């Protein structure tokens, strides 16, 4: 599925109070931040430059300088008429993606109070059906400046596809790396008298695709429930897989783990 996108978070706590934050992401992994105190882009990894020159990054910096202030200052003055009420939040995401190693499409979507509001498609701003009349007015306003729309369209159409192929090949050795999990077993909460809950933790793995199952010999236990895959501060992943059993029938149980790092040798723990 892999995509690249830039996000923008603006909040209008008070009349006296407001925050805004801009950053770039390659799926889950952060790669860029905008640093207002000095007014520059911040590369979080040495390969965050991709295949782009200083010349071009310089021009991209002029652009974000201008837009984030203008956009921010102008949503504040259009608020009274659009009937945005304090406090409120605005969110934007834009970028593009690849399906099987070729570019697939771009997007640019905007949200008000946690819900879809407007989107940018085929060189124009479009209103989201359930948002109603305030979303129509907002598009009326955003389409007036045809100049600024052609610039927005050239970022999504041309700059972004070149960027993501350059980013990915430059980050090759970090994204294609392989890291082996560890595993361990513990008691979970009892579902009721006469019964136990077995928990099996898997942690430290990269990449993300993993397989974990409770077993009786060769026979997979279909009561196995796996949870969410959760992040860990160093970049690797974490998971638990649980099973409820009558306590008389808990002998001869094991947890088995398969992952691309292990090179064929599955991890197996015995209860």
């Amino acid at each position: 599925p892999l995509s690249f996108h830039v996000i923008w978070i603006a909040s209008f706590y008070n009349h006296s109070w407001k925050q805004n934050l801009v950053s770039g992401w390659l799926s889950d992994l952060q790669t860029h931040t905008w640093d207002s105190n000095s007014s520059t882009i911040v590369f979080l990894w040495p390969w965050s430059r991709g295949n782009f020159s200083n010349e071009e990054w310089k021009e991209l910096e002029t652009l974000f300088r201008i837009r984030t202030i203008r956009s921010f200052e102008g949503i504040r003055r259009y608020a009274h008429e659009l009937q945005f009420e304090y406090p409120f939040e605005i969110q934007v995401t834009g970028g593009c993606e690849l399906h099987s190693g070729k570019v697939s499409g771009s997007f640019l979507q905007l949200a008000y109070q946690g819900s879809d509001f407007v989107s940018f498609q085929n060189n124009s701003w479009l209103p989201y059906p359930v948002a109603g009349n305030m979303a129509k007015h907002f598009c009326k306003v955003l389409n007036q400046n045809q100049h600024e729309n052609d610039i927005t369209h050239n970022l999504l159409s041309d700059t972004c596809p070149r960027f993501i192929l350059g980013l990915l090949d430059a980050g090759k050795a970090h994204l294609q790396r392989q890291v082996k999990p560890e595993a361990w077993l513990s008691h979970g909460p009892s579902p009721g008298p006469g019964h136990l809950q077995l928990v099996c933790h898997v942690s430290g793995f990269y990449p993300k695709p993993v397989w974990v199952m409770w077993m009786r010999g060769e026979q997979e236990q279909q009561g196995t429930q796996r949870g969410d895959i959760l992040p860990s501060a160093d970049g690797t992943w974490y998971l638990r897989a649980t099973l409820e059993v009558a306590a008389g029938e808990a002998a001869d149980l094991s947890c088995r783990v398969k992952h691309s790092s292990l090179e064929g040798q599955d991890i197996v723990l015995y209860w």
Binding site: I9, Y13, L21, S203, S232, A233
Partner: protein
């Protein structure tokens, strides 16, 4: 819309009393973004805890990671306390190795 937070606590490595480790607190699915997160040792705050940059999912809801070094002990109690406008009072989630 307002959405209320989901709170998950976990350790990076299995507990071994007297050995350094990392305690995590993942807070996800909330809106709006205004939130207070703490990690507590014996119900008192922990200074210098670090967190990810604010980000959101495809359904617009926000998520954060909070984490810190810690050395678990036979008798020490560790938790995660969260406050959000969706909550009639602050919510605590204890870390239990079992």
């Amino acid at each position: 819309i307002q959405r209320t937070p989901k709170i998950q606590v976990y350790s990076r490595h299995p507990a071994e009393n007297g050995k350094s480790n990392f305690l995590n607190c993942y807070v996800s699915g909330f809106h709006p973004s205004d939130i207070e997160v703490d990690l507590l040792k014996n119900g008192e705050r922990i200074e210098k805890v670090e967190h990810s940059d604010l980000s959101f999912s495809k359904d617009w809801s926000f998520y954060l990671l909070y984490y810190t070094e810690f050395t678990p002990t036979e008798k020490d109690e560790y938790a995660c306390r969260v406050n959000h406008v969706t909550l009639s009072q602050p919510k605590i989630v204890k870390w239990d190795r079992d």
